Design a protein around this ligand. Structure first.
Ligand code: FES
Ligand code: FES
Ligand SMILES: [Cl-]
Ligand SMILES: [Cl-]
Ligand SMILES: [Cl-]
Ligand SMILES: [Mg+2]
Ligand SMILES: [Mg+2]
Length: 907
């Protein structure tokens, strides 16, 4: 141990530390500075950026011996606090740079290091700096962050007044459609919002820290577990196995389809008889600390009979394949799509047919914050779970029978979270912490490290796809055929539904009167499938949007013009036989056309012999809602102090659940003249908030937004004074009148897609968009650089521009990763941010362009559709179409690795 007298945030600290200790650990645990956020723990993400003697370092790979006596450290807490914001923190808030906010402290600290050395940086300087210092963001696509640096810089330089960093009201009082900052912005940019790991450091002693004992093979029969050595190890309380589980020890898929050949109880909470994938939790060590738990977990011995593993869809779908779940065939679900006439004869007689085999792989969500949960037995005897669940009511019913509790005896609460991008549509650690809390009686806490986040949370499921188009010489689509195989890993949850998405979205965007297709779901021993932003669209529309460009090339037609010809117009139906609710695609194409022609011209002019430039186009379509007559509930309550709380279980991945609530409520409350700062939101809690539903399927703004609008409309009626005006709280209570008002809303006109034909009206609101990608391909290396992305977006009406801009920028960046760099195929290699091809700032162009072409939705609140998954429907198709336009080569199987591109280039 050594004494180090240093300065931390301007205050002299008398530090007593292990020289080998990590600065991140010291700052967070010993000094309580949880504003230093830790994600990857491997120096790759920059979340832990601190300033050490004028240099930006990553505290997670800075050992205390590198901290000299009298050193000066600045963390986010020293940059500024809620009542004393730094220009960089004000700028972040104004520009909407905090979405999930997990990266915000590191980014702001890093940016402060930048401005202290380069006071008046260019946009490229900013990007260069964030690249060098490895500041990663998964939410924003970087543009708003650079916007914020530039604006703060102007203020610090004395070029602009600081008051210009404060939000200005639109001068009618309308925050709907505005750039009003999200309520959580201040806490995020000051590091005063407590995420799961932060809460764990602030829990009382007696809290047990968990570590997972995980399978180190992909497929096995378990013979026994030996905990003897682990129990003698330092800090160890006990080891939990399947024997300690009070219920079925199974997670249920809950809405398993009838034609599913599996019962949907295939997933264990703790492995009993079998290992189904690498990483499966077999046991939980409970100890006094994470470090001690992890140490002992290494010594728990599992006796395994290793079985052959099927590591892809095709391998597991073979006739001769051994059943992974005995009694259930590996191909456990099939969804046909049968629309209009038989396609066989139409394909035979058409002027032009095209066909293609396409692949989209196991994309890893890669949130900066790795999975974390905790649980405890309350004084009331209920079991409470606090996690990253983005569907608390959903997960309750998925886990309750497994852990052995009645629905009334378990409570699920969503912590503030650093992004999920769909992986939290699945339970990850909830049942594990419940089981541990129940068996021990003590508070338990479980934090995954980044490797576990990669290997042992759900992934986008790979699809092997064959799609075909039949068409007239004028470009009129006549028919389509489709076959898709979905590799869902060993756990069935929502696998059949994902498969159904192929029926709804392969070929979405165009009038296609005749379709014959078949989707198949298959269990494998690769990572289990959890929703990933887009959920079926990125796979489906990659195939159909690439094939649209192939059809265009065969016709001798401009790809944009071919789309203009076939795009939804009044009278047309989508693939499930349903009429579009608005018709905005022709409008969006027309407005993009000149930008597209201008991009083509630039591409040809600026191309060289070694660096070829191209332009690609795609369309994107997705539903807003869960399938069928989806519904939400909200409560509007006037409180004693004259504020209004809107109670919902609108789960915040980071997308802006808080601003969606406040924005929608304010618009609905306008007649009563309610200031936005007086409107409160609620963190999701199964006991104290209504079943608003999960934050999945880009549904909340529509479903819960409507429910909030109805609740607020009903509160107005309850507050309405006879003869005009409104009662106060005190007046209402004195009259013994209610002050907490319910509102519900239902997508009444929706129906589920039929099990035989795939036809129906699954969503009443869809999202529509047109993508344009501009790329440069280096033909010597096969390396693609995306120079610009454009999205024409119809969102009906914007609740909040900061939120929708950020959403789109974020999804476009994930499109670049999906197209060029991202995959989880090799269990070990792809277990880091860098190894799995996470897009750092230089991989994302500064040129991200949005054009809103809003066609108000009949069923949307004030006209709004969702936005969440739109920017990820097909941006990767536009990118791949752009590579083809640049070089003549088509990548059919994502991602377009440089070597892969080179191989095609030289074929
Ligand atoms: S770089 Fe330190 S937590 Fe990622
Ligand atoms: S706001 Fe950057 S990771 Fe979420
Ligand atoms: Cl998916
Ligand atoms: Cl390929
Ligand atoms: Cl490569
Ligand atoms: Mg027609
Ligand atoms: Mg090669």
């Amino acid at each position: 141990m050594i004494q180090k007298v240093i300065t931390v945030n301007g205050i002299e600290q008398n530090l007593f530390v292990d020289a080998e200790a990590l600065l991140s650990d010291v700052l967070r645990q010993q000094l309580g500075l949880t504003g230093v956020k830790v994600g990857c723990e491997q120096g790759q993400c920059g979340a832990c950026s601190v300033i050490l003697d004028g240099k930006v370092v990553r505290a997670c790979v800075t050992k205390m011996k590198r901290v000299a006596d009298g050193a000066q450290i600045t963390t986010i807490e020293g940059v500024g606090q809620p009542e004393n914001l730094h220009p960089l923190q004000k700028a972040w808030v104004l520009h909407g740079g905090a979405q999930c906010g997990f990266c915000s402290p590191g980014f702001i600290v890093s940016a402060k290091g930048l401005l202290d050395t380069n006071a008046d940086p260019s946009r490229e300087d900013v990007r260069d700096w964030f690249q060098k210092h490895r500041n990663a963001c998964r939410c924003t696509g970087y543009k708003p962050l650079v916007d914020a640096v530039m604006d703060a810089a102007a203020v610090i330089n004395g070029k602009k007044p600081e008051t210009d960093l404060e939000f200005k009201m639109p001068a009618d009082g309308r925050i709907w459609g505005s750039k009003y900052p999200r309520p959580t912005a201040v806490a995020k940019v000051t590091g005063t919002l407590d995420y799961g790991a932060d809460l764990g450091l602030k829990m009382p002693a007696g809290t047990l820290h968990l570590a997972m004992v995980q399978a180190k093979v992909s497929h096995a029969n378990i013979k026994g577990i030996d905990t003897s050595e682990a129990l003698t190890m330092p800090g160890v309380h006990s080891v939990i196995t399947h024997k300690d589980v009070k219920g079925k020890n199974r997670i249920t898929g809950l809405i398993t389809f009838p034609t599913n050949k599996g019962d949907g109880w295939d997933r264990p909470i703790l492995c009993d008889e079998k290992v189904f994938q690498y990483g499966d939790c077999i046991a939980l060590v409970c100890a006094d600390s994470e470090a001690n738990a992890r140490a002992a977990a290494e010594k728990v011995k599992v006796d395994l009979e290793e079985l052959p593993a099927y590591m892809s869809g095709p391998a597991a779908a073979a006739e001769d394949a051994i059943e992974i779940h005995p009694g259930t065939p590996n191909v456990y679900f099939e969804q046909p799509i049968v629309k209009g006439e038989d396609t066989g004869p139409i394909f035979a007689s058409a002027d032009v047919t095209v066909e293609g085999d396409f692949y989209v792989g196991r994309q890893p969500h890669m949130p900066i914050e790795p999975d974390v949960a905790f649980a405890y037995m309350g004084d009331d005897g209920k079991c409470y779970i606090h996690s990253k669940s983005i569907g608390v009511h959903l997960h309750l019913y998925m886990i309750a029978p497994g852990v052995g509790l009645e629905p009334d005896q378990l409570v699920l609460v969503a912590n503030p979270m650093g992004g999920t991008f769909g992986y939290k549509f699945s339970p990850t650690s909830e049942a594990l912490v419940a089981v541990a809390a129940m068996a021990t009686g003590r508070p338990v806490h479980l934090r995954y490290n980044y490797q576990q986040q990669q290997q042992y949370t759900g992934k986008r499921s790979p699809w092997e796809m064959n799609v075909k188009f039949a068409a007239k010489k004028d470009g009129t689509l006549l028919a389509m055929e489709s076959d898709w195989l979905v590799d869902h890993g060993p756990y069935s949850e929502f696998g059949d539904l994902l498969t159904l998405r192929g029926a709804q979205f392969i070929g979405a965007g165009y009038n296609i009167p005749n379709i014959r297709g078949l989707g198949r779901t298959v269990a494998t021993n690769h990572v289990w499938g959890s929703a990933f932003r887009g959920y079926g669209a990125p796979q489906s529309m990659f195939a159909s949007e690439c094939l649209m460009d192939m059809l265009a090339e065969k016709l001798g037609m401009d790809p944009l013009e071919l789309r203009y010809k076939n795009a939804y117009r009044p009278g047309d139906t989508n693939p499930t036989g349903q009429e579009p609710e608005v018709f905005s695609l022709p409008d969006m194409i027309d407005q993009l056309r000149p930008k597209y022609q201008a991009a083509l011209e630039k591409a040809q002019k600026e191309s060289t012999a070694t660096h070829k430039k191209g332009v690609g186009i795609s369309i994107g379509v997705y539903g807003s809602g869960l399938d069928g007559p989806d519904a939400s509930e909200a409560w509007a309550e006037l409180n004693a102090d004259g504020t209004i709380t809107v109670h919902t279980a609108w789960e915040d991945h980071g997308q802006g659940a808080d601003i969606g609530c406040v924005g929608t409520a304010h618009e609905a409350l306008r007649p009563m003249g309610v200031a936005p700062e007086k409107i409160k939101f609620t963190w999701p809690n199964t006991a104290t908030t209504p079943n608003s539903g999960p934050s999945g399927g880009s549904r909340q703004q529509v479903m819960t937004g409507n429910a909030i609008r109805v609740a607020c409309e009903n509160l107005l009626k309850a507050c309405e004074k006879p003869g005009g005006g409104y009662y106060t709280y005190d007046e209402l209570k004195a009259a013994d009148k209610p002050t907490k008002i319910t509102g519900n809303w239902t997508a009444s006109g929706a129906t589920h897609c039929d099990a035989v034909t795939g036809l129906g009206k699954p969503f009443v609101v869809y999202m529509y968009g047109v993508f344009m990608a501009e790329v440069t391909v280096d033909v010597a290396t096969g390396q693609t650089t995306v120079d610009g992305m454009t999205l024409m977006a119809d969102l009906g009406s914007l609740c909040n521009q900061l939120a929708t801009d950020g959403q789109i920028y974020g999804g476009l960046a994930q499109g670049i990763g999906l197209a060029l760099s991202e995959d989880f195929e090799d269990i070990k290699k792809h277990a880091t941010l860098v190894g799995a091809g996470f897009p750092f700032i230089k991989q994302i162009p500064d040129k991200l362009d949005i054009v809103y072409v809003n066609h108000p939705r009949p069923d949307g609140p004030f006209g709004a559709s969702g936005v969440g998954e739109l920017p990820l429907t097909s941006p990767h198709a536009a990118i791949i179409n752009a590579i083809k336009s640049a070089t003549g080569v088509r990548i059919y199987r994502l991602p377009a690795y440089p070597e892969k591109v080179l191989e095609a280039l030289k074929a």
